[PDB]
Every structure is written in structure tokens, then in C-alpha cells.
Amino acid sequence: LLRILKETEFKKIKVLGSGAFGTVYKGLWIPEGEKVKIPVAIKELREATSPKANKEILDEAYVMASVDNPHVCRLLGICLTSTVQLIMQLMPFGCLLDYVREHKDNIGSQYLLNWCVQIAKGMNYLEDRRLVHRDLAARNVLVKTPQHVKITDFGRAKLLGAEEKEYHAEGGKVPIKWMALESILHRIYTHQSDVWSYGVTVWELMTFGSKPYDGIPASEISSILEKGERLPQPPICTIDVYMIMVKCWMIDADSRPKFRELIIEFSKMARDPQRYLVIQGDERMEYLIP
């Protein structure tokens, strides 16, 4: 299913934001002379990918290019030359983190809760496809419509060999404040290391795009977590909601919740939003001629 693309099928118009891990252009693609245009997002990764690195980005894109779930962003086409290029259905509303941050006032508790479900759903699918997204966070979730979020990719997901449960990343730059502890101390990432980032990410939306462990150097998130500190109760959060997050930040990772469970809970709290989420002011929110 993985479309391998000709550098001359898509024209990358403008730069749409760019990290030092990658750079995302927008973003128009037209298949082999085929008719007209479908606006895509071009993710181009950056740091010199080894032969083993590429196999990995490959394998996952074979999977990413074949997703059926609505809450995971499906790959369109990849474009190897001297650089990688993922072709993505363009998402206009965009980075969700940056959405809640400035639609703060009008975001209901119904949205917050569904979003969580959707995400938990996307993430659940990616688990059933042996994937280990290794990069789930609020910035990494996209808005189709304000009532429909999809999880996007940028190469960091890793495909799991049938008879494996582990994964041992190499080195380099990691989102440290969203990672579990094995991940941090051990460069080990699994499906539970993945739920832990579900934790941070839901805390991230409950605090309305507030910054995790703010004021504290990544240099010892390691120890704060080692001492026993986690992310604070968000203000809008009744105990029920919030110790579901604080379940995801447990040390031993086999006993963090599973996305399959995580789906039920938030799905039930979802058909009863205000009973769990309290947001002050919630109930309102040529031819013709002269």
C-alpha cells in the first residue's frame, strides 16, 4: 500500500513550521499526471539516518501507510532520495496542543473527553498493529474537525517483531518530559511506555496546553519520578479523571492501564462530561462582456 513517490509529483509550497528533528512543508501533491491536486503535508526528516535507522522508518511506514482507523493519520506516500519524506493528508486546524491553548475559553468538557477517547482509540489501534509510536504528545495530535482528532507520525514509531515486546532506541534527542522512566533511564520503549505518554498528554489537555514539569530541567525528571513526584491534578479535574492519568505514570509498566481499558473508562466518563470535568462556564461555549 506504501506509495513510493517521484520528487516531481509533489511541490512543497511553504514551510509550515520546522523542528531540528525534522521540517514540515505544505504541501501539494498530484499523482502521475493524474488529473488535479490533493494538498498534502511533506515531513522531511533530518539527522543522517543509518542503514538500520532506515529499515526501521521503512517498516513502520509500511504499517503507517495501511491504517484503517479514523483516529490515526494514515500515510500517503514516502519519498526516499538523500532524505526521507512522508506524505500526509494535510490537516488545516493542525497541532492540537496549539489549539486548546488559544480556544481555551470555548473548549467544553465534552470535547476534552471525546478527544481523550479518540486519541485512546487511535493509540489502541496502533497497538494492535504491533507499533510503538514512541512520540505521542499534545503537539503530535491533529485536528480534522474540533470533534475529530487523529494521531500523526514523524518516523519515530517502531514496529514490533511478532515475538518481541521490547524496543531499545539507539541514542540522540528524546522528548524527555513525556517519556516513561524505563524509556528515560533505559532507552526502552514498549506499549506501556506509550500509555505513560498518554498520561502526560491528557494532563496536557486538562491543563489546557499547560507546560509539563514547568520550571524543572529535564536533567532530573529522572529523579523527581524516582522520588515519586508526578504531574499535578489539573484544576478542572475531579479525582476520578485525574487518578486515571496518575495510573499511567506508575513505575512498573505492565500494570499501567492498557489503551483497551483506557478506552472504556474515558468512554463512560464521556457520556456524562460535567460529572467529571468542571469548567467554569461550561454549559455555554473569455465569456461575459461589458
Binding site: 491543563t207 514547568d214 524543572i216 508526578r230 491534578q233 478542572i236 506508575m250
Partner: peptide, 30 residues
């Protein structure tokens, strides 16, 4: 139906502890 926090005029601590919950504090151990 409302067991929210108690935060003073709102603010939130950088981190909240769960020590000595052995399930959260990590046997360093050292």
C-alpha cells in the same frame, strides 16, 4: 460530582508527590 482540587486562586505546583507509594517511588536503591 465535584471533588476538584484546592488551589489558591488557581495556581498549580510544578509537581505533586505520591511518595512513599512504593508503586510510584522507585527503589533507587542507594
Amino acid at each position: 460530582p465535584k471533588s476538584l482540587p484546592s488551589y489558591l486562586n488557581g495556581v498549580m505546583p510544578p509537581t505533586q508527590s505520591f511518595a512513599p507509594d512504593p508503586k510510584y517511588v522507585s527503589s533507587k536503591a542507594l
